[PDB]
């Protein structure tokens, strides 16, 4: 045989490249996964994931109360925290022993997968008691926040789009939800007649997850790294695999 | 008048026989229900059931977390099945008390009414994280199990369909959501324009129910008989009740 | 050792020690407890029984 | 063939009998069991059972602490009867905040399988710190009681031997132990050397039960009556089954 990585017979070579390739290809294809992560950063360092995976489009909602801290078994002051929320729902409406909750998330960070066309992404990103706009009657439901993400990269690859606000201050308390459509560059509308009620299918086959880990460190190395998934850390940092034609 | 049981003049036969052969296809119209359950076993012998019933198709996703044995009201080793989650979600992620926690499901039956069509149910059985196949980007977000559905089967009858898997293995730890279509022999597409916005509706509207039974015999009696639904038992037993042309 | 003593017991964990208790009850007689379960966790799976190569295999008595 | 229970060849009803003579005279050979059962009777109407069977010997030995009721899974007043024991041990040497513990026996029934030699039976009745006689110097290790146990008869056949003692003053604080060997007829003695590692071995081999039941009601139903068992309660009601040359 010849030898390894000196010509075009090193079919090892060229097959390890394929393979790298076709899973990119395959993601983006209409038959692959567009995926969604919302983080939301606690105060004490660490980190609550909500992710979901599906067909042709994706997306999470939350209420205020979702997305605040709950430590699995361990105390959390529930009662205290149902009378925070009201305090937050209305001002002055609770009997709370705090100012501030430090089970309110500082920041979030939503990313999609690289299957997602940026140009389809929207958030509603609403009050406490889940008005995007104040009141209801002027409320658009969403907007497209598309232009605000930024490409996290490796080697060149766009691996995933991310968009980060911080929740620095005491009235940025917030219910959330995001959503994207898989890209198609095609003239095929997945949503039209032929296909439709496979998309209403994959609404009940989308796959959910949500965890809470104890530090970005522990997301990064046990969560991130391990599913190959895309991430931007506090220091600006990307994390992901490159694939696109590559070994 | 004719004496029963003897002539074509038993109106009360013949008014019995097209009342249950007036729900049998009821349930089979456009207008009918289609239902799917989801069955977790625990090793402690009791069962989760989740069930949603609907119009048009349906559809359960749970995460490997939701899919656990919770025990209302007693205590459930709530702190170190957290950790048995982290170690769960990744090899040596956490530090849990126990190397196989009594929580995780033994076994998964998926049964669906039989107003199915068997060759639209499609399964997506991922991984502890919530993927599909190892990586999203290789990942088809569902596979098409409806083959490997077995007939409920009474007095002739298809009262319903099962897909049964155990999971008796330590690496059997699964995310899981099924779908299903309601039969439609039409050229009518349900989710054609015309249609489209009460599929939408039948989101909504369709209705969803949990609980966990102590036993598979309290399974039997107080859940699957009383509601005339369709069962596979341990012991390859099926449950329902035949309706089409019978008394 | 009896039957309880083979049961599975968390030393300073929680044992559901009075649903075991009832446990035993039905095990003893059918239906003759109040549990909250069909089939106790704690109950051995299984045993193996070893003897150190100083036995005599032929003396062995269960 | 010949009608049934008119003839020597009613071969089922000679089968009958001769299999009931066979499990007693079985159980009387030297391959067989011999059993004894101490029932403590509490205030409270429950009963601890401890019972104990063996080849060729058998016995009991119980602490006046391990002799106490102890209701599991419940509260026992642990820390005051840790003090109790402290002032039954020796007169005023506790700080309880009770005149007499219910959980004292007021009663011991002891209880002989017929396949004893009443004459080989051996009590050890101590005082609290378990001492048979007063003091250690004096004590005669045990007194034998054979003569005091009156037979348990059902349809005329002994089914075995009680004697019963109650505790109902305050002084009647005991340690207690029990013993007997298992009738042997022959001239063969079990513990000579040809067989008494044999012996050593039942030592090892001797199974033992504790429970404590709820009441006498539950006893008799639960415990005596579907293993067969002998028990005369507390209105001299014989409990057993006979066997002897019977159907
Ligand atoms: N392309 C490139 N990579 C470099 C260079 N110097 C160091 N590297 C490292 O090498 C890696 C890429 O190496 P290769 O994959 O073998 O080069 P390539 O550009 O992909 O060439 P092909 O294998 O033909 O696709 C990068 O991740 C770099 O960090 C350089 O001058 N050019
Ligand atoms: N069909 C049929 N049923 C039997 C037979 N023998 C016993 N059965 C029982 O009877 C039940 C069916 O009885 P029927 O409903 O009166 O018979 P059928 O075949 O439905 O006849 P139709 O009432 O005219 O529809 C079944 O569930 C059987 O368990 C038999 O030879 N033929
Ligand atoms: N022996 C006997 N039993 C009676 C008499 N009257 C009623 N019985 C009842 O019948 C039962 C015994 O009946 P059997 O076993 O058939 O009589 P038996 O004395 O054992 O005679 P065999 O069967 O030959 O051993 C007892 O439990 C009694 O309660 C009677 O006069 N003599
Ligand atoms: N030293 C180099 N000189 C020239 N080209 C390089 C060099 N290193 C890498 N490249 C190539 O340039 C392209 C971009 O790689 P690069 O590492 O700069 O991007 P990145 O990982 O997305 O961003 P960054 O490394 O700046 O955080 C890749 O094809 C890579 O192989
Ligand atoms: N003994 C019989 N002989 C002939 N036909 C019967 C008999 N019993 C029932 N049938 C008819 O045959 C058809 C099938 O009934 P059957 O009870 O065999 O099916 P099932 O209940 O789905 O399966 P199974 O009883 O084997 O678990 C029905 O129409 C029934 O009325
Ligand atoms: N009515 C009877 N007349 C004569 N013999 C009887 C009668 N009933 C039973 N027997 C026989 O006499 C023997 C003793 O039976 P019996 O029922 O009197 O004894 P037991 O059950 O040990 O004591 P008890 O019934 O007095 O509590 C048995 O062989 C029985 O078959
Ligand atoms: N604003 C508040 C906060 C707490 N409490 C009282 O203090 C008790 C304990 O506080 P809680 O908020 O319940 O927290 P923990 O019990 O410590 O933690 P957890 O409930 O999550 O286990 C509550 O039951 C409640 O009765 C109160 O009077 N009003
Ligand atoms: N891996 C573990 C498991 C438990 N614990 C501690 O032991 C306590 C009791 O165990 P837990 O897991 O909370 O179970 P329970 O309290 O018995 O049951 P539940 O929480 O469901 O009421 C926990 O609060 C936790 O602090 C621990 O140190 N680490
Ligand atoms: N069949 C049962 C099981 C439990 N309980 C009640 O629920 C309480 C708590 O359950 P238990 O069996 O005692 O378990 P834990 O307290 O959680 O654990 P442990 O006793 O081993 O500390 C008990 O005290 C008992 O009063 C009951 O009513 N009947
Ligand atoms: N003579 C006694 C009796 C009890 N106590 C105190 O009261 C508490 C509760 O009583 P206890 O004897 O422990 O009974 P319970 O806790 O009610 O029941 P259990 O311990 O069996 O669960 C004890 O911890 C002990 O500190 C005491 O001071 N001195
Ligand atoms: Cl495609
Ligand atoms: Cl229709
Ligand atoms: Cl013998
Ligand atoms: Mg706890
Ligand atoms: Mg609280
Ligand atoms: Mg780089
Ligand atoms: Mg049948
Ligand atoms: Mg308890
Ligand atoms: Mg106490
Ligand atoms: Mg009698």
């Not at 090892?12 to 692959?32: A, D, I």
């Not at 930024?150 to 201050?169: A, N, Q, T």
Request: include cysteine; hydrophobic fraction near 30%; charged fraction near 20%.
């Amino acid at each position: 045989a010849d030898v390894a990585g000196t010509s075009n017979r090193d079919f090892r070579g060229r097959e390890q490249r394929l393979f790298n390739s076709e899973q990119y290809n395959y993601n983006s294809s209409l038959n692959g996964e567009v995926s969604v992560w919302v983080y939301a950063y606690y105060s004490d360092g660490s980190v609550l994931v909500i992710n979901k995976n599906s067909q042709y489009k994706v997306g999470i909602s939350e209420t205020f109360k979702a997305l605040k801290e709950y430590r699995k078994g361990q105390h959390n002051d529930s009662y205290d925290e149902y009378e925070v929320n009201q305090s937050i729902y209305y001002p002055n409406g609770g009997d709370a022993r705090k100012f501030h909750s430090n089970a309110k998330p500082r920041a979030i960070q939503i990313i999609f997968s690289p299957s997602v066309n940026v140009r389809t992404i929207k958030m509603a990103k609403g009050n406490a008691v889940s008005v995007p706009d104040e009141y209801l009657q002027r409320s658009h439901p969403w907007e497209a926040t598309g232009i605000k993400y930024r490409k996290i990269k490796r080697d060149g690859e766009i691996v995933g789009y991310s968009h980060y606000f911080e929740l620095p201050h005491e009235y940025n308390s917030i219910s959330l939800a995001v959503s994207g459509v898989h890209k198609n560059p095609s003239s095929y509308n997945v949503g039209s007649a032929h296909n439709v009620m496979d998309v209403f299918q994959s609404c009940d086959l989308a796959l959910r997850f949500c965890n809470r880990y104890w530090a970005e460190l522990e997301l990064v190395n046990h969560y991130i790294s391990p599913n190959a998934y895309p991430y931007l850390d506090i220091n600006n940092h990307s994390y992901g695999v490159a694939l696109s034609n590559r070994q």
